[PDB]
Design a protein around this nucleic acid. Sequence first.
RNA 1: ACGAAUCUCUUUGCCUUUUGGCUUAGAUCAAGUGUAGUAUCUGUUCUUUUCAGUGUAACAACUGAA
RNA 2: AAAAAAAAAAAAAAAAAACUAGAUACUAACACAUUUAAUUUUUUUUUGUU
Lengths: 215, 26, 242, 41, 102, 75, 151, 103, 31
Amino acid sequence: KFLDEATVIGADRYGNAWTLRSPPECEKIMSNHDPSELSNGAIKYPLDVITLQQKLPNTYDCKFKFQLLNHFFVNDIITDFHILDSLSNSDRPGCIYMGLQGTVGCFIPLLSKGNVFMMGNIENIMAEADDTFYLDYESRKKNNIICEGSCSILGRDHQEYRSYYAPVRKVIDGDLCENFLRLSLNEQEFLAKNLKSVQVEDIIQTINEVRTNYM
Amino acid sequence: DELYLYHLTLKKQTNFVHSCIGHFVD
Amino acid sequence: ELLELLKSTNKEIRRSANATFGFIAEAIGPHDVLVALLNNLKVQERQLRVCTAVAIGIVAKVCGPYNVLPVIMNEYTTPETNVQNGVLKAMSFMFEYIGNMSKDYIYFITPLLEDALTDRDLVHRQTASNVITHLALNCSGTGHEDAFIHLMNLLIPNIFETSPHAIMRILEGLEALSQALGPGLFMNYIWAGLFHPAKNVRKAFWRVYNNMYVMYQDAMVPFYPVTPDNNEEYIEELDLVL
Amino acid sequence: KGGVWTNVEDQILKAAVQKYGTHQWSKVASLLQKKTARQSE
Amino acid sequence: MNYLEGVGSKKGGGGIASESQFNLQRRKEVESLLSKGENVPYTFQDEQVRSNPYIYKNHSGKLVCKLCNTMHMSWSSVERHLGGKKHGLNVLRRGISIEKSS
Amino acid sequence: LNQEWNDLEKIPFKCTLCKEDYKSPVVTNCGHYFCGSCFAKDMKKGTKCFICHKETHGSAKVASDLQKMLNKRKS
Amino acid sequence: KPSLSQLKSQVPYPQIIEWYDCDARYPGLLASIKCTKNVIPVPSHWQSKKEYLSGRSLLGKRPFELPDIIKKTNIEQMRSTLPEKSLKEASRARVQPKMGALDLDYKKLHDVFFKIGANWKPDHLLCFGDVYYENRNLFEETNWKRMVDHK
Amino acid sequence: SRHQFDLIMCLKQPGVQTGLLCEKCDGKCPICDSYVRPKRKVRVCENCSFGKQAKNCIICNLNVGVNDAFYCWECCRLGKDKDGCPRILNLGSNRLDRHFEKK
Amino acid sequence: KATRKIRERMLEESKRIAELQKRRELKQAGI
RNA sequence: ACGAAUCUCUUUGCCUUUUGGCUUAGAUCAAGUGUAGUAUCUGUUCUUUUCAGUGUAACAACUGAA
RNA sequence: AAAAAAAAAAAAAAAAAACUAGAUACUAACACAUUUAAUUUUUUUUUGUU
Ligand SMILES: [Mg+2]
Ligand SMILES: [Zn+2]
Ligand SMILES: [Zn+2]
Ligand SMILES: [Zn+2]
Ligand SMILES: [Zn+2]
Ligand SMILES: [Zn+2]
Ligand SMILES: [Zn+2]
């Protein structure tokens, strides 16, 4: 699809879901010229770009490359994206996908620089929780939740899974952040000790904000 | 200038591939 | 008194002497202590340069890397070689001690690893690639990813390098950069010479491919450079569209 | 019991003896590791 | 009355210094002798006529012949090279290469 | 040990807005103290404390404990 | 052993194939892999007995320049590395010692990496298919971008 | 071992028993030999268990073991964790040669 | 001795330079 | 040709701290080791006859007889 | 501050290899004093008496 005029969202047979942006070097040019020029005629291309054509006739044929913008792995095969301008009067425009095995999900842009930080911190908290509990147990046996995968119930690291075919870029997993609601208060206040920042109550506020206000 | 996305799973995948028969919880 | 004491032949000594620089650097301050350490990289004897290189890694973790790093990036300019390895070795240690952080500090060190992988003598190209192994694993998934193509473009020509300590350090780097880039964007460099006529060029690429295939078996499957004509059988179910 | 003199430690004597003269042998062995004054002289 | 002995000490700091420190001192002086005191300049310093004029020091510490593009570990090695038959040739080749143009 | 690398009265008696006696006093989630007229007027412009610049959310308690410690008799 | 003229006819990009590709055990496959959409050629310094990095360019490489944002932190002046103490005066320093050598400011150092230099990113870096060949020098290429824009 | 080339690992299917490290080799990853940031316990095969052999450090296999052995975080990211039994079999060139010279 | 007095003389000259440029800067402000 | 001025050059001549003193040289004191591995100078030999095999990306190199 | 011009020779796309010995820098948190309380060098023609 197109989220935008310079960018694109996609899927794979294998489950990846990615967003590709076209570079600004190409945006200045495509903005300052009339399309008839591209095929033949004079576009003034920087010294470098041509030398990539001659040095690599196969790769740089076009001659620019998208910069991968997001990548993330959801084990379904995404059939349709639907870019919505809003969901239920929400401000943040979402793009809601739907998969083969049956699914719906959404990618919501986070417009803050402030939120993406917090949510980031919460994904990092819950991501290795099964490791943290385990280190506290080991060191509390040394001097005075038994399995290493206790909190994840299976061995998998998160980033290793959600990465899979290729590493995640900017997509922060909001379905992991949402297990934080399901823990007992003892465990929540245990995990949250890692943040100099706000208390459990404010985490839960933040996590819950997305369904209420953003969709 | 980037794009930061947040993922949710609204409705979970429904192809049920495995089953088991017992008594798990009382 | 400690900085003289790590000449000792024992290890547990050398190891505890370095740990107590963190306890002092936390106490008094990092910059008073660094200048003590950096003056000691000029020294010839290897234990002393490695055991200082550890301590600068330890002072970085405990007092924060932003305090240490520009003093180390400056010391790298000195024309003596033993300093320039000791400043690259110290940076390896300090990026495995601050595990996750490391993302904040990239972009600054790409130019410092620029001169290292470009440099003539074979040991710099060994220690900077030993920085990349630590810097790639734990900064993967961040979204830098364009610093690791830069850092990759400089490594691959070292694939032909011999020496045993040099070549395993470079393979470790190439194995680690695979996780910053992904097997696909990384494999583009490796398909070409995977056959090749040269028996040598061929021999060197196969090592790298073997390391990749172990970490990724089902993760390479989308990326193989195989077409219906290029092989007899292919698989007809990869072209199917519903 | 070797105390064998490489062509470097021969070349450093003739430069040391030129500098320090022949009666300062204690100083010549300062420029020259592995070797004492009685060995240098 | 221990003045009878005849040894003493100055009241400043802590004397002997550390074996590693002696090597640094000794390997500078040895490279001063064999060098016959000349200052061999760094490669980046933007040129005190040199005794010869080809030998330098790279951005690292090593010595290099800029004709022959050889790298040297020590002054002792260099004097081997300057007295060698390869560093002889490259002077003759530059000899001819100049004698064919001005 | 201070690291650069990394009967106190905290109650002003006159306002920070009125610069006058506290009347119909107000408490925030801080130890901030204002008049009922004070705090309502600051939110007409400012999002946060007139002092901390922390988030007040317009949240204001009746501060009677102030009038207490502003009594000569306390409570 | 197909002549390269025979081998260049198979390929959608005949300009990559070279005289030696003819001798590969499986050239038909090699020519098709090499000409695949995004494969990047093997670095060219094989067949060179030189050891990849050899002098002639490396003789004149400049020592190091700190990135400008870091150079703002003033360390360049406090420790002069380019290009002293009697051994007695050094051993007196171990016993005394002297404090506050650098006089660096902690708040300034932190901000360079975080607040001010948050988004500072290196000027050129490299692109997907740029391998570093031995004689290339990036210090020219970086300036040539800087040159074209300002003039 | 990372720096000593002659020593041969086991690389068989790990059982349920935990490897042990002597006081001297304590705190080390058996793969990269680093002292930092452990993650997972090691697990060694049965045929490295049995009698006296089971107790000895899984690195030097000489001294007796006490603490558990963990894989460091970086060795669990790459996957070198699960290759196999991370136990050194031979005593190696370095250890022998010191031994005979001393006597 | 040679080195020590050299370096000390360098220090003294630096101090002079410092005071001079002080006086110039204060002059630039009229004082 | 010659009286003769000025710049340039060689030589003779002139020359710089050409070592601060003194005594019983004023006295006395000094280098760790082992396992694995690479880098870098110099010395010595070959650009020199054909073909057949081994070998190499191609050389080279190696192997036979006129 | 500041105020032009005009009289129809050259150009260059920027020493090895082998042999044999010697010389010096350097690389691996390489190893350098603990090692020993469950467990396989302990080997002989079987031969310890209420
Ligand atoms: Mg006295
Ligand atoms: Zn030369
Ligand atoms: Zn008021
Ligand atoms: Zn407040
Ligand atoms: Zn052990
Ligand atoms: Zn490890
Ligand atoms: Zn085993």
